[PDB]
Design an enzyme around this catalytic site. Structure first.
Site, PDB file in Angstrom:
ATOM      1  N   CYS A   1       0.943  -0.805   0.156  1.00 22.24           N
ATOM      2  CA  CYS A   1       0.176   0.008  -0.147  1.00 22.24           C
ATOM      3  C   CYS A   1       0.735   1.523   0.499  1.00 22.24           C
ATOM      4  CB  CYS A   1      -1.222   0.109   1.198  1.00 22.24           C
ATOM      5  SG  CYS A   1      -2.212   1.287   1.189  1.00 22.24           S
ATOM      6  N   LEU A   2       1.104   1.865  -1.388  1.00 25.33           N
ATOM      7  CA  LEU A   2       2.441   2.987  -1.394  1.00 25.33           C
ATOM      8  C   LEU A   2       1.877   4.074  -2.219  1.00 25.33           C
ATOM      9  CD1 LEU A   2       5.212   3.585  -0.633  1.00 25.33           C
ATOM     10  CD2 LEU A   2       6.118   2.528  -2.461  1.00 25.33           C
TER      11      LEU A   2
END
Lengths: 802, 76, 148, 77, 76
Positions: C86-87
């Site tokens: 989750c970037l």
């Protein structure tokens, strides 16, 4: 009282004079209030289950009701019986037990007790034996429905107050049963399917007079019904077509109008079509899976030995209760199929749906003259005012019926000449997106269109070909509407492709069987290339990764299966991945077949510079997986279940190449796609096709090999041009592409050089500068001719030694 | 004098009113007995929308008549 | 024409200057399927663990972010059991000038800071905002279980 | 302003919401029209599960969005 | 200290700052006119982020330097 019910055929003449005695005396209502509650008590307490099985009893009850209803002075004041209306706090399941009209309307062969009586004796009856059981009850159900219609129609014409009282009575039942459409509704707290199906049929039969084949009585239904607030139908919480809550409220406030019975009935029958039989069909459709779940639960327990006295009896009773539940469920599923297969009742429902579609199309008409004159063919603001404030059930109901009812060979939809009325409404919904902003009900309508155009087992044209050919409104704009809705389905995302699957069947069938649509296509590409290029691009974009998704899903299914080859969520995800793999495999094949049949006749639309580079890369990437080890090593069990036939898909894939093989641009683009190009790929495909004897002709293989040789010599010339350009200055390279810039332009934001095509592709995704996040447009660029002059000078310097 | 008010859900209620009372006063009484704010309420008589500033005698509403109260569709 | 030379020059640049705590390269001779290996920051419970990366380059890499997933199981709130990360820069905050080396450095920065306002795993996100002693202990426990 | 919610059974529902409304507010409204308590109503948007304590003004504000309903059942063998 | 910041559309705002401020303190100078949460504080300065938790004395912001404020779409 008991002897009156037991011997009604003898008291029918003795008691008639007693009834007439109170008509002239004005005291009929006292005896009416004394008798009918007593009849309800007798049906409830003295008989545990007043149903269709006791042929003696309800036949006498209906005879009593027929005796009472005939009298004109009595039917006009029949609504004043104590308990005629339900309670304000009455439970939805108590309508059929604490009302005068309750038990009589519940007479239906789809009840649990009748199903147990006539289905539970033998569970594996043959198909021929099955129809006899249904037909033994369908004729009797027809008599019951006819008698109930005879009673209720006489209630309608009894007086002006009775018709309002009955509309109020039906409204209170409709509003209390809004949970029938739920996923797991409280079946023990909602009305039974039998009580509501008869009511749905009665209003549809009421609609028969002013829905005649002349369609001249269509003006009896008011098209301005929803401008005023509804006093019977509760629109609170009901979704409108193309209007939100605030605009609908202001439109009620705007323009500030007397109630009429025809419109009150014609929109109540649709509510009963939706929340009634619409919920019944969804209830029956889930019987195919609950039985499967219960069978596994029963099978698991049967392997357990029972020794502990406290626990052995519990286990023994658990199996017996589940056996009775399975009996009831298998009886109900078989009973509902026979109920739905009765054509004498379903033809009427479908004819009413056709008439209602005619009425809706008349409403859409600005001149409101549709049944006489044919109509001529942002979104919410430009939508027609009467059409935009209508609720969303008037479309959801009939579409759910037609989707669900089409699965039988005995469908009323087949061979019904009045069918074309619904098709015109569907094509109207297809044409203008202003009518409905909901793409999901649109997807259901398109899927219904896909179901209607499916070829039969004997490969004959479906029951819809005649209407796609012989309807003057449909053939004008069906093609454009489908092509337009294909690209808008874009607005994870495991459902935007099923709509494409349904659109693909319609496109391929229309291209196959209808030559006029074969001219409208080609005309679309030659005179409206801008619209059709977007459709081509939208088809091309998804096709790159559908095969990747299918390969991932089949590997996922195999891994999950090997997990159980050593908790239930893994099985659930196995089914979920299986469905997505099937969808991927089917839609990839449909896209490839459409590409084949389109490149067969119009290769000129596939050679445009805007799609030619994408098409070659997509085709090469798809080819390498099919001929490579990825598809070969993936050994799927029963590949026909998932429609995963790469051997059959390879033929269309190669035909796409050979169809475009007569264009130099296509040959050059493939040779310039070094990502997934190899001369050995087509050589492997030759042997793969040779494995399937008779699938590919020797001349087919020869043409493929000639195309491969031309592409190989083209790429050899390309690499010859590549080898003569070795070491290059860094300033002559695109900072994003790292190649020689053909048309270097200067970025106004970052003051850096970039190719026209590179920044054009970047701006095709976002209007921002890659290098400093500044806003950027195509018109803000500045050509760099000075740098291109040095590019030409350096290229000519390198040409001095070549 | 008493009147009958009918709801979309079928609730039947009584209310003592006067011919010269404002309709907003009637809505205030309906709120007093049921808690429904007057702006949300919407009364219908003889299939016609009513007005707050008018009176019962202006609309020729006889005693023991039937009123239809429609709750204006609230947002979410 | 559009994708091959960009990936080739990006590979050559990392070949010139390999990252200190990281290492990336293609899987076999398939240019569009790479593998990256990183070593956890010392100022973190992820130190001493080695993680491999599953990389899938799309056909339009110079204009679309890559598909990169973790291989080793790690006790981290922003990483699910599938190895997804989750970037931010792997989404609409992508820029064509960004390099894969910078993406791997950003992976290490995320491992260092562990932004909790992006709850890919709700339980680990709740754990981090209540008591460090269990999150830090479990990170090293799963590093010893897997990242060895 | 309205959003879409879809379920594994193929049922499409519409629901008008507000940016300041919380996620639990949407669950409560769905409970009325679906007979499902909010504790079982799990929603999926862009592949990431939502939070009960959040609202509809942080997850990618846009009109005519379509949420997915994943039904977790209280009970499992 | 007069500092500049610009949005996506091109609008810019003008106000004061201090050398001893923090990034959230500059953000605290952002919601006084527009009203955006400090969690959405995004500073794109020459291709690198400006961390919100740090102070102003580390992002080498000079007089009348132009910053870039873009609303965030976090989650996922």
């Amino acid at each position: 009282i008991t002897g009156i019910v037991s011997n009604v055929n003898s008291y029918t003449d003795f008691l008639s004079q007693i009834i007439q005695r109170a008509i002239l005396e004005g005291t009929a209502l006292d005896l009416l209030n004394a008798v009918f509650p007593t009849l309800l008590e007798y049906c409830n307490k003295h008989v545990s289950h007043f149903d269709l099985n006791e042929s003696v009893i309800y036949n006498n009850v209906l005879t009593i009701f027929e005796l009472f209803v005939t009298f004109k002075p009595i039917a006009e004041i029949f609504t004043k019986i104590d308990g005629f209306f339900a309670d304000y706090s009455c439970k939805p399941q108590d309508f059929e037990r604490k009302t005068i009209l309750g038990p009589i309307l519940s007479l239906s062969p789809i009840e649990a007790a009748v199903a147990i009586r006539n289905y539970g004796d033998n569970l594996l009856r043959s198909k021929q034996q099955t129809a006899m059981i249904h037909e033994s009850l369908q004729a009797e159900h027809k008599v019951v429905i006819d008698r109930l219609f005879f009673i209720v129609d006489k209630l309608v014409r009894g007086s002006l107050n009775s018709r309002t009282d009955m509309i109020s009575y039906f409204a209170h039942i409709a509003n209390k049963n809004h949970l029938r459409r739920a996923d797991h509704p409280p079946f023990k707290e909602l009305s039974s399917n039998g009580f509501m199906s008869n009511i749905t049929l009665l209003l549809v039969r009421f609609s028969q007079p002013f829905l005649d084949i002349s369609y001249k009585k269509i003006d009896k239904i008011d098209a301005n019904y929803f401008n005023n607030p509804s006093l019977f139908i509760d629109l609170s919480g009901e979704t409108r077509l193309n209007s939100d809550f605030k605009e609908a409220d202001a439109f009620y406030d705007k323009n500030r109008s007397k109630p009429n019975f025809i419109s009150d009935c014609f929109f109540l029958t649709l509510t009963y079509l939706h929340y009634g039989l619409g919920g019944t069909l969804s209830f029956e459709e889930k019987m195919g899976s609950e039985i499967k779940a219960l069978k596994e639960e029963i099978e698991k327990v049967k392997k357990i030995a029972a020794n502990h006295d406290v626990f052995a009896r519990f286990i023994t009773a658990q199996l017996s209760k589940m056996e009775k539940a399975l009996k009831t469920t298998e009886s109900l599923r078989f009973a509902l199929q026979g109920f739905f297969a009765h054509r004498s009742l379903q033809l009427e429902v479908f004819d009413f749906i056709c008439g209602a579609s005619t009425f809706l199309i008349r409403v859409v008409d600005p001149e409101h003259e549709f049944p006489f004159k044919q109509i001529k063919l942002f979104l919410r603001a430009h939508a027609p005012v009467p059409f935009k404030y209508y609720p969303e059930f008037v479309v959801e109901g009939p579409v759910n019926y037609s989707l669900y009812i089409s699965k039988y060979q005995t469908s009323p939809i087949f061979r019904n000449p009045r069918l074309g009325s619904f098709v015109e409404f569907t094509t109207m919904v297809l044409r203008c997106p202003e009518l409905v902003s909901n793409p999901h009900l649109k997807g259901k309508l398109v899927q219904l269109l896909s179901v209607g155009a499916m070829p039969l087992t004997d490969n004959s044209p479906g029951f819809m070909m005649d209407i796609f050919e012989h309807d003057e409104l449909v053939n004008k704009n069906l093609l454009y509407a489908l092509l337009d809705f294909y690209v808008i389905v874009e607005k994870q995302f495991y459902d935007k492709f099923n709509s494409r699957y349904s659109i693909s069947i319609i496109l391929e069938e229309l291209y196959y069987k209808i030559p006029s649509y074969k001219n409208q296509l080609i005309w679309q590409s030659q005179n409206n290339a801008d619209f059709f290029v977007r459709f081509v691009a939208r088809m091309l974009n998804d096709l790159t990764f559908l095969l990747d998704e299918g390969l991932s899903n089949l590997a996922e299914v195999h891994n999950i299966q090997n997990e159980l080859d050593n908790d239930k969520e893994l099985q659930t995800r196995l089914a979920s991945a299986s469905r997505q793999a099937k969808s991927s495999c089917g839609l990839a094949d449909k896209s490839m077949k459409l590409f084949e049949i389109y490149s067969k006749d119009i290769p000129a639309a596939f050679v445009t510079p805007e799609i030619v580079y994408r098409l070659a890369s997509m085709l090469n990437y798809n080819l390498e997986s099919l001929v490579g080890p990825k598809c070969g090593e993936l050994k799927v069990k029963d590949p026909q279940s998932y429609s995963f036939n790469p051997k059959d898909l390879l033929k269309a894939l190669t035909t796409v190449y050979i169809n475009l093989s007569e264009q130099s641009e296509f040959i050059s683009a493939v040779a310039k796609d070094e990502r997934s190009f190899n001369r050995n790929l087509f050589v492997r495909a030759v042997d793969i096709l040779g494995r399937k004897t008779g699938l590919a002709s020797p001349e087919f293989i020869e043409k493929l090999l000639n195309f491969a040789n031309k592409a190989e010599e083209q790429r050899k010339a390309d690499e010859e041009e590549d080898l003569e350009y070795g070491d290059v200055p860094d300033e002559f390279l695109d900072p994003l592409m790292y190649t020689i810039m053909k048309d270097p332009v200067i970025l106004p934001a970052s003051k850096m050089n970039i190719d026209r095509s590179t920044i054009k592709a970047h701006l095709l995704s976002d209007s921002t500068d890659p290098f400093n996040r500044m806003p950027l447009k195509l018109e803000d660029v500045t050509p760099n001719e000075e740098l291109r002059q040095k590019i030409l000078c350096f290229k000519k310097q390198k040409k001095e030694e070549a | 004098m008493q009147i009958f008010v009918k709801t979309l859900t079928g609730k039947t209620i009584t209310l003592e009113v006067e011919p010269s009372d404002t309709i907003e006063n009637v809505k205030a009484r309906i709120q007093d007995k049921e808690g429904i704010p007057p702006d949300q309420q919407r009364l219908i008589f003889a299939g016609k929308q009513l007005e707050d500033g008018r009176t019962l005698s202006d609309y020729n509403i006889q005693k023991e008549s039937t009123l239809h109260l429609v709750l204006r569709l609230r947002g979410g | 024409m559009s994708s091959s030379k960009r990936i080739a020059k990006e590979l050559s640049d990392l070949e010139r200057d390999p990252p200190t705590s990281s290492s990336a390269g293609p899987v076999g001779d398939d240019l569009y399927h790479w593998q990256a290996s990183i070593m956890g920051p010392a100022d973190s419970p992820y130190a001493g663990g080695v993680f491999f990366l599953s990389i899938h380059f799309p056909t339009d890499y110079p204009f679309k972010p890559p598909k990169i997933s973790f291989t080793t199981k790690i006790y981290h709130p922003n990483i699910n059991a599938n190895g997804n990360i989750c970037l931010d820069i792997l989404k609409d905050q992508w820029s064509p000038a960004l390099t894969l080396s910078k993406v791997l450095l950003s992976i290490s920065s995320l491992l260092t800071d562990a932004n909790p306002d992006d709850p890919l795993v709700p339980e680990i996100a709740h754990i981090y905002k209540t008591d460090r002693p269990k999150y830090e202990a479990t990170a090293r426990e799963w590093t010893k279980k897997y990242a060895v």
